[PDB]
Structure 1
Amino acid sequence: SKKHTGYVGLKNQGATCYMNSLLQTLFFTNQLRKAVYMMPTEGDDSSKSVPLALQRVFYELQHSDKPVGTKKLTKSFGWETLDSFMQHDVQELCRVLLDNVENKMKGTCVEGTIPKLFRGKMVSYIQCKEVDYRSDRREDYYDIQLSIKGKKNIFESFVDYVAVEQLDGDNKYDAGEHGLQEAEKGVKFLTLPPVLHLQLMRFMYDPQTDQNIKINDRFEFPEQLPLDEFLQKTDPKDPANYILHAVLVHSGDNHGGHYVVYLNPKGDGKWCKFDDDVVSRCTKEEAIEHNYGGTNAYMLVYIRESKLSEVLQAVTDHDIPQQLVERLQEEKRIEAQ
């Protein structure tokens, strides 16, 4: 309900699984929201336009007192059934949403907003021990998948993410003309984005048991996350200290269950629980400490301390172009009549 917390829910759809959790998360990434409103969607069709459909949901979440529907948005990228959401991860849905937007924002004042907010950089190397050969590949990433099995916390997950793997014995590195060689494999972070999307791997295929198992283990994530020690080169002027913004939680059975997101929208430590149509205030401990598990958190969103004021900049009704408002209201008039 809007009068309590000032924020509005999304309509209850069991088929959509984790979409409402993602939509709310992306909606309260305010710099993206402003950016999404400026997309030149005039020419796009009312039914099959994902950028327009995201504009509608965002517009409605900003203005509506009643809960917001997502039926038009689901129809725009063709994930109508339950099976569609079941055979995709949350990061993949986010890729589908942000690609459409990123492509629409090309050739505009808002170009490069997605990579500005989300794109970091890393290096993957393979270094041979006893022979002079190295293989560096630079990669962009818009999200990080973290390992949690036998890991107490995020710090240990980042330790494991950058940990050097030893390619030796039966798993020796095929080094081309040099042949089978003992080698070291590893990953190093060059940059970390303003908005950091961390997915926690709670579904590892087990080799010994020979079955996909869910992981219900306790996993601790902090309100503040320093990441300088995991960068190759630290900047004194801009340290990589991050603030917890969102916690996407799942409960109950796999293949149905119940999805909730917890959010810290203004970055000010004042938490709200977004349970589909019901938005309500909650404690830090309900959002953070009580979702450690051992009910499990699967995605976490951190925002960089230095970029917080820009990323969560105040949106108003004036930051939506009139042409878009006129269009969306003209739809709302016809639907009601």
Structure 2
Amino acid sequence: SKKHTGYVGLKNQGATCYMNSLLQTLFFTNQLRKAVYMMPTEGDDSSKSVPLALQRVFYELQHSDKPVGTKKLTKSFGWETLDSFMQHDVQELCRVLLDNVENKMKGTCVEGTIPKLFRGKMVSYIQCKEVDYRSDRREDYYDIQLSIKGKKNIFESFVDYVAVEQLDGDNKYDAGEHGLQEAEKGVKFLTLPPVLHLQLMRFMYDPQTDQNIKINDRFEFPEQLPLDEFLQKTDPKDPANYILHAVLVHSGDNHGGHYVVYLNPKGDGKWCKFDDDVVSRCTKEEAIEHNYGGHDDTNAYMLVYIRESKLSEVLQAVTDHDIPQQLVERLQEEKRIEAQK
């Protein structure tokens, strides 16, 4: 309900699984929302424009009192069924949406916005111990998938992510003209993006069974997340102190089940729980501490963090002015014609 919280829900579409969680997470990334409204979609066809459908949802989430539909957006990118959602993960859907949006933004006033918000850079290195050979690759990333099994927390997951693997014994390094070799393998963060998307690896392959078994472990994650010690070169002018923004959560059976996002939309520690059409207020503890794990003696799977330095910019106030007039004309013209029944 909008009166209690200020925010509105999305319609209970069970087929969607994790979409409603992601849409809210992306909508309350305000800098994206403003940029999305600027996309020049006056050209595009209503039924099939992914940019337009994400403008429609955003528009409505901002303006509506009653819960917001997603039927037109699901039809655009072509994941109408439950199996289309099951087959993919949340980060892949986030790529399907943002890769459309970034591509529409090229050659516009709002180009670069998706990399501005979401794209960090990292080095993957292989280094031989005895011989002088080193292979570096630079990779961009839009999201980090962290290991949780045996890890108490995010600090420990990052320790693991960056930690150095030894290529010795049977699994030595094939080092070209220099032959098979004892070597160190590792990864190093260069930049951490303003909006940081972390997936927690809740599934592993199992040797017996021949299937993916889920992990219902206590995995602790903090409101304030310092990450300078996981960068190669730090900056005193801009530390990598991250502030928690959203927590995406699953419960119940995997073949379906119930999805919720917990959110901190102003970044002021005032938490709400977005259960599909029912937005409500909740404690910090309901959002953070209570979504840690199977502690009776429900699991968090994605976490969003925002860079403290970039917080005011990222979560800048959206106004009705920030949506173009022609887009307001178009989207109200649908609501005029569709109501006329």
Q: TM-score, normalised by structure 1?
A: 0.99
Deviation (angstroms), 1:303: 0.2
Structure 2 distance, partners of 1:207, 1:243, is 38
Deviation at 1:174, TM superposition (A): 1.0
Aligned counterparts of 2:78 and 2:13: Cα–Cα separation in 1: 16
1:318 paired to 2:337: no
Residue 253 of structure 2 corresponds to residue 250 of structure 1: no
Q: 305, 308, 315: which one pairs with 1:305? A: 308
Cα distance in 1, alignment partners of residues 8 and 239 from structure 2 = 34
User: Shift of residue 175 of structure 1?
Assistant: 1.0
Distance across 2 between alignment mates of 1:285 and 1:17: 24
Deviations 1:37-86 (A, max 9, x none): 00000100000000000000000000000000000000000000000000
Please give the alpha-carbon distance, in whole angstroms, between the structure 1 residues aligned to 2:244 and 2:207.
34
**Secondary structure of the corresponding residue to residue 135 of structure 2:** coil
CA distance in structure 1 between the partners assigned to 2:273 and 2:5 by the alignment: 10
Counterpart-to-counterpart distance in 2, 1:209 and 1:187: 32
- 1:147 is displaced (CA, Å) by 0.2
How far off is 1:206 after superposition? Answer: 2.8
SS in 2 for 1:177: helix
For residues 181 and 330 of structure 2, the distance between their equivalents in structure 1, rounded to whole angstroms, comes to 63
Q: 3-state SS of the aligned residue for 1:86?
A: helix
Distance in 1 between the 2:209 and 2:63 partners?
51
Q: Which residue of 2 aligns with 1:11?
A: 11
Q: Counterpart in 2 of 1:140?
A: 140
Question: Alpha-carbon deviations, 1:140-171, whole Å to 9, x = none?
Answer: 00000000000000000000000000111111
Q: Helix, strand or coil for the counterpart of 1:69?
A: coil
Q: Name the SS of the counterpart of 1:200 in structure 2.
A: strand
SS at match of 1:135: strand
Secondary structure of the residue aligned to 1:136 is strand
Q: Compared with structure 1, are the counterparts of its residues 188 and 208 closer, same or farther at alpha carbon in structure 2 (3 Å cutoff)?
A: farther
Structure 1 residues 217, 264: CA separation in 2 closer, same or farther (over 3 Å shift)?
same
Deviation at 1:288, TM superposition (A): 0.1
Unaligned runs of 5+ in 1: none
Distance 1:139 1:202 in 2: 24
Farther-moved stretch of structure 1 (176-185 vs 11-20): 176-185
Classify the secondary structure of the residue corresponding to 1:92: helix
Aligned counterparts of 2:209 and 2:189: Cα–Cα separation in 1:
33
Q: Once the 2 structures are TM-superposed, how far is the Cα of residue 277 of structure 1 from its aligned partner?
A: 0.1
**Alpha-carbon displacement from aligned partner over 1:1-32 (angstroms, at most 9, x marks no partner):** 11110100000000000000000000000000
Structure 2: how far apart are the matches of 1:126 and 1:201? Answer: 24
Q: CA deviation at 1:179?
A: 1.9
User: Shift of residue 211 of structure 1?
Assistant: 3.3
Higher deviation after alignment, 164-173 or 80-89? 164-173
SS at structure 2 position matched to 1:109: coil
Q: Which residue of 2 aligns with 1:119?
A: 119
What is the CA-CA distance between 1:209 and the residue it aligns to?
6.0
| Root mean square deviation of aligned Cα | 0.8
Which piece of structure 1 moves more, 163-172 or 24-33? 163-172
Query: In structure 2, the residue corresponding to 1:21 is in which secondary structure?
Result: helix
Percent identity, aligned pairs only, is 100
Q: Runs in 1 of length 4+ with deviation above 4 angstroms?
A: none
Aligned residues, how many? 337
Partner of 1:330: 333
| Aligned-residue offset at 1:208 | 6.1
CA deviation digits over 1:85-133, x for unaligned, max 9? 0000000000000000000000011000000000000000000112111
Compute the displacement of 1:212 (Å): 1.6
Which runs of 5 or more residues in structure 2 are unaligned?
none
Task: Show CA shifts across 1:247-289 (max 9, x none).
Answer: 0000000011100000000000000000000000000000000
Aligned counterpart, 1:38: 38
- Structure 2 CA distance, aligned partners of 1:43 and 1:84? 28
Q: Secondary structure at the match of 2:134?
A: coil
User: What secondary structure is seen at the aligned counterpart in 1 of 2:114?
Assistant: helix
C-alpha separation in 2, matches of 1:150 and 1:207: 18
How many angstroms apart in 2 are the aligned matches of 1:174 and 1:13?
A: 50
Aligned-partner SS, 1:335 = helix
CA distance in 1, matches of 2:2, 2:73: 22
Instruction: Give the Cα separation in 2 of the matches to 1:120 and 1:319.
Output: 27
TM-score (norm 2): 0.98
State the alpha-carbon separation in 2 of the partners of residues 308 and 206 from structure 1. 40
Give matches, 1:1-337, under 5 Å. Answer: 1-207=1-207, 210-294=210-294, 295-337=298-340
Deviation at 1:207, TM superposition (A): 3.7
**Partner of 1:169: helix, strand, or coil?**
coil
- Measure, in 2, the Cα distance between the counterparts of 1:190 and 1:248: 26
Q: 1:104 to 1:121 in 2, by over 3 A?
A: same
